[model samples]
Target: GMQFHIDDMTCGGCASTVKKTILTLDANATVRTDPATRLVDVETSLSAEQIAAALQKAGFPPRER
Candidate 1:
């Protein structure tokens, strides 16, 4: 599992996009987001770099900390 800070993910819809993007990369991924804090938690088989890259391509760049 990994957590990222996505400053531009500002709403529920944005969170949904984040989740969908991750899911598209890893169908079994478990994704959770808190738009209030601009945080996203993901549990998946994909690499951290892969996830970040996919999110960036999906227009929600993630700050992996």
Candidate 2:
């Protein structure tokens, strides 16, 4: 899983946006989110850099663990 600390992902809406964006990139991706923790775990075929860029594009930039 690719884990990220998305400080902006503080609500269910934010979580959905992140999830949707990731799915757009990898429809068969596995995604799990926690608004309370501002964290997301994703299992996709995309590269880490690609994932980071897409997450940023989704309006919830993330920090490394």
Q: Per-residue lDDT tens digits of candidate 2, residues 1-65?
A: 78888999876578889999999999999989886788889888887788889999878898856
Top candidate on lDDT is 1
CA deviation > 4 Å runs, candidate 1: none
Tell me each candidate's RMSD, in Å, in order.
1.2, 1.2
Instruction: Tell me, by TM-score, which candidate is best.
Output: 1
| CA lDDT, every model vs. true structure | 0.89, 0.86
TM-score of each: 0.91, 0.89
Note the residue pairs that clash in candidate 1: none
Q: Which lDDT value does model 1 have at 47?
A: 90
Candidate 1 residues 1-65, lDDT tens each?
89999998985588888888898889999998986788899888889999999999999988997
